[PDB]
């Protein structure tokens, strides 16, 4: 074990920027000697650390992080093996692992021309734009914007919710020795998330200790379509039609829109529970007097959060906290993008403008984190194992099968064997894998 030097870790990895507005600025490097001078003089000093973001008194006006793709490291003359084959090959080459094609991607992602991403976050877009203008002014032509994506916390009563309306960012792994765990939260070694930290089994280049791999995905959400699907398929029952539709949505996610976990409140929302971080994660999927292998009355086996953090489905403690599959944890720092749903789109139940989630996951091993969750769990009709019926189906939120409707089982409380064939509501437009270096490497090795 080694001490976690949070002064040297970029803040979005373990804290999140937590600003109203964010920009993902995807760049190429020209004239690398010039880029390097400015990386050291202009970027390194303003990169926000975990220590800095952990203190509410030291949030910067513009929170800035930076990460490099494999081709960006090579553009900087860094030929080292960072110890991650998925990172080295790039996300476009990994697309088929997720039963999608780069044919659907933003063209800039379907390749390896992108050398890095600057994440800028501030409470206004004006301040972000000023920082971009400063960067472009000082780097000059040594940096070139290839693509960018603007994102924002949603307005009003949807602040912190993603575009389908669900509170998001509730559940994260706790870093042992750094975070004070919340009830039900998994507790993991720092090296699950931070390269070269405690119990990261993969040897890293020395300069890379304190970094993390950033998996970025531009995930479009078909919000009018999702809403209409829930109404059209709402289970029979006592409430309004919309209340019954809401129940189906909650069964798909594993939480009500308020954040309340269905495992703890399976038939109705509990907004007070959803808001309470001391209670809203305090579950394992186990219930005394129920067979874990067949009981879907509390939460379907196919629910998004159950697919992505299986808890007792992969063994371990039946009482909280369940600590299973710690090595498959990811830190998420996603933020919604695009316009709110327009009046006409809602009325027609049809998407016209692109909106969704600018998905960001951090992990020390891409093969254990984002890639694993997507391929081995969400996209696997027989995961979790040991269930009856054994065919759980796909994750209804993110599960993919090469554009086909997804078979998703267990969603209907009245009959756990009932199956639904559900079109995608989330459409990948691609992304890239980056390495967010420790801050010391920015003006250090990467600028050398
Ligand atoms: C547009 C796409 C997505 C949407 C709308 C979505 C939405 C949500 C929501 C509403 C939650 C529950 C609240 C929370 O804990 O934050 C959640 C949790 C989670 N999501 Fe997703 N998500 C998306 C994509 C993904 C992807 C691509 C992955 C990984 C491959 C993923 C992994 C997770 C994980 C690990 C959790 C927490 C599970 C837990 O610890 O209980 N999500 N997501």
């Amino acid at each position: 074990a080694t001490s976690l030097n949070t002064i040297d870790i970029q803040g979005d990895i373990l804290v999140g920027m937590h600003k109203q507005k964010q920009l993902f600025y995807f760049f190429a490097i020209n004239d690398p000697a010039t880029f390097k001078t400015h990386l050291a003089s202009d970027i390194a000093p303003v990169v926000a650390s975990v220590t800095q973001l952990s203190n509410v008194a030291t949030q910067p006006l513009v929170a800035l992080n930076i990460a490099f793709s494999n081709t960006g490291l090579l553009a900087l003359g860094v030929t080292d093996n960072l110890g991650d084959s998925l990172f080295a090959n790039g996300q476009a080459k990994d697309a088929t692992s997720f039963k999608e094609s780069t044919s659907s991607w933003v063209p800039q992602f379907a390749g390896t021309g992108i050398h890095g991403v600057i994440i800028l976050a501030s409470d206004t877009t004006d301040l972000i734009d000023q920082q971009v203008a400063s960067i472009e002014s000082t780097f000059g032509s040594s940096i070139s914007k290839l693509y960018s994506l603007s994102a924002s916390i949603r307005p009003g009563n949807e602040a912190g919710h993603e575009m389908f309306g669900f509170l998001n960012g509730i559940a994260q792994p706790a870093i042992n020795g750094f975070n004070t765990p919340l009830p039900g939260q998994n507790i993991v070694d720092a090296g699950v998330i931070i390269t070269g930290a405690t119990n990261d089994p993969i040897t890293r280049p020395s300069w890379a200790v304190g970094g993390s791999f950033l998996a970025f995905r531009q995930l479009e959400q078909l919000v009018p379509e999702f809403n209409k699907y829930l109404l059209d398929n709402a289970p029979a029952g006592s409430g309004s039609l919309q209340a019954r539709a809401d129940l189906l949505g909650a069964r798909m996610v594993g939480r009500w829109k308020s954040g309340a976990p269905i495992d703890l409140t399976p038939t109705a929302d509990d907004p007070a529970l959803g808001a309470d971080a001391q209670r809203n994660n305090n579950f394992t999927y186990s219930h005394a007097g129920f067979d874990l292998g067949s009981d879907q009355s509390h939460c379907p086996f196919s629910a998004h959060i159950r697919k992505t953090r299986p808890r007792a489905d992969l063994g371990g403690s039946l009482t909280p906290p369940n600590l299973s599959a710690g090595a498959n944890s990811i830190m998420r720092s996603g933020i919604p993008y695009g316009p709110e749903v327009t009046s006409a789109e809602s009325a027609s139940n049809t998407t016209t403008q692109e909106r969704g989630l600018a998905f960001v996951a951090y992990q020390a091993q891409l093969s254990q984190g984002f890639h694993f969750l997507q391929q081995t769990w969400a996209d696997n009709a027989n995961f979790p194992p040991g269930k009856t019926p054994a065919t759980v189906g796909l994750d209804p939120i993110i599960g993919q099968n090469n554009g086909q409707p997804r078979v998703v089982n267990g969603l209907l409380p009245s009959n756990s064997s009932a199956s639904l064939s559900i079109p995608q509501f989330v459409v990948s437009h691609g992304g890239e894998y980056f390495f967010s270096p420790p801050i010391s490497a920015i003006g250090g090795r990467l600028s050398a």
Side-chain angles (χ1 to χ4, degrees), residues 1-237 239-448:
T2 54
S3 63
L4 192 68
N5 192 9
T6 57
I7 193 164
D8 204 31
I9 300 176
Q10 292 196 58
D12 194 44
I13 299 165
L14 299 181
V15 185
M17 302 304 217
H18 293 290
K19 297 289 195 175
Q20 288 296 309
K21 305 299 179 180
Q22 197 153 306
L23 178 69
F24 297 90
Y25 179 100
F26 299 97
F27 65 86
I29 298 165
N30 291 316
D31 190 15
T34 294
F35 184 97
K36 288 173 173 277
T37 300
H38 292 283
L39 183 64
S41 63
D42 307 337
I43 295 295
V46 302
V47 172
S49 71
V50 167
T51 298
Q52 179 185 7
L53 298 191
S54 289
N55 185 339
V56 61
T58 58
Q59 305 295 298
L61 275 186
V62 180
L64 185 150
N65 277 190
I66 189 167
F68 292 91
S69 68
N70 175 71
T71 53
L73 292 180
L74 290 168
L76 296 174
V78 177
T79 59
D80 305 56
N81 174 18
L82 277 67
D84 198 288
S85 295
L86 292 175
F87 166 72
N89 280 289
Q91 194 185 117
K93 284 180 69 178
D94 205 23
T96 59
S97 300
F98 310 134
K99 298 189 175 169
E100 76 193 53
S101 173
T102 61
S103 88
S104 62
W105 287 18
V106 177
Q108 291 94 314
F109 290 139
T112 59
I114 289 166
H115 288 162
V117 59
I118 306 178
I119 302 176
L120 303 98
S122 193
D123 286 326
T124 68
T125 59
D126 287 341
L127 289 165
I128 289 174
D129 289 344
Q130 287 170 20
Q131 188 76 42
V132 172
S134 173
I135 289 166
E136 290 183 345
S137 173
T138 61
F139 279 77
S141 310
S142 73
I143 196 168
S144 174
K145 180 180 68 151
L146 297 177
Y147 180 57
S148 68
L149 185 68
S150 295
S152 184
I153 301 184
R154 292 189 63 215
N157 67 21
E158 297 294 338
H161 299 229
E162 53 65 54
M163 286 286 178
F164 293 143
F166 295 76
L167 185 60
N168 188 39
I170 296 170
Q172 302 278 24
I175 305 297
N176 189 46
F178 174 65
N179 292 111
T180 295
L182 296 164
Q185 193 178 20
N186 208 351
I187 302 167
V188 306
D189 291 318
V192 173
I193 303 302
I194 303 298
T195 54
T198 294
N199 292 340
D200 172 13
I202 311 302
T203 294
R204 311 298 183 170
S206 47
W207 58 263
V209 174
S212 186
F213 296 99
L214 191 175
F216 179 87
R217 302 274 285 162
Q218 180 175 320
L219 301 180
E220 174 178 14
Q221 295 173 251
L222 305 179
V223 178
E225 291 84 349
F226 173 82
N227 290 345
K228 180 59 156 59
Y229 184 91
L230 298 181
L231 288 163
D232 287 346
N233 293 275
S240 66
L241 179 56
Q242 186 66 66
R244 298 189 282 111
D246 293 341
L247 170 64
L248 181 58
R251 300 276 292 177
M252 291 185 180
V253 172
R255 298 185 180 273
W256 298 92
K257 286 173 170 181
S258 70
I262 70 179
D263 194 57
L264 296 185
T265 183
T267 58
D269 190 19
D270 183 336
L273 170 59
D276 186 351
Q278 290 290 311
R279 297 189 305 119
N280 66 13
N281 217 21
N282 196 32
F283 60 96
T284 67
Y285 301 122
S286 181
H287 302 272
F290 293 84
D291 180 351
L292 192 70
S294 61
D295 172 39
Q296 299 190 75
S297 73
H298 304 86
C299 183
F301 300 144
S302 53
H304 175 56
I305 64 162
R306 187 159 186 164
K307 282 285 212 169
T308 60
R309 182 190 172 204
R311 308 184 195 217
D313 285 343
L314 286 178
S317 187
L318 302 184
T319 58
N322 179 272
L323 295 166
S324 79
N328 303 114
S329 303
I330 62 172
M331 210 62 84
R332 291 175 298 127
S333 205
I335 180 167
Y337 76 91
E340 292 288 308
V341 176
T342 66
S343 293
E345 284 173 294
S346 192
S348 65
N349 304 306
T350 305
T351 290
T352 291
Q353 292 185 63
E354 191 186 341
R355 58 184 59 82
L357 185 63
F359 173 94
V360 176
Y362 293 103
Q363 59 265 286
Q365 294 181 247
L366 284 164
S367 69
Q368 300 307 290
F370 160 71
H371 167 118
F372 196 81
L373 272 50
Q374 183 73 57
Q375 175 180 50
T376 296
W377 293 350
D379 289 356
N380 183 348
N382 301 330
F383 185 84
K387 302 312 192 178
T388 302
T391 306
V392 166
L394 306 192
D395 181 313
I397 305 305
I398 64 163
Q400 292 186 155
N401 191 24
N402 290 122
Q404 304 175 272
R406 293 85 44 66
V407 173
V408 185
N409 297 335
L411 297 174
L412 297 178
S414 70
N415 179 357
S416 72
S417 295
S419 187
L420 290 172
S421 179
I422 312 188
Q424 293 188 21
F425 309 122
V426 174
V427 177
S428 175
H429 296 307
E432 184 55 282
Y433 296 146
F434 305 88
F435 180 65
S436 290
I439 295 171
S440 53
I442 299 173
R445 173 69 187 91
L446 303 183
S447 295

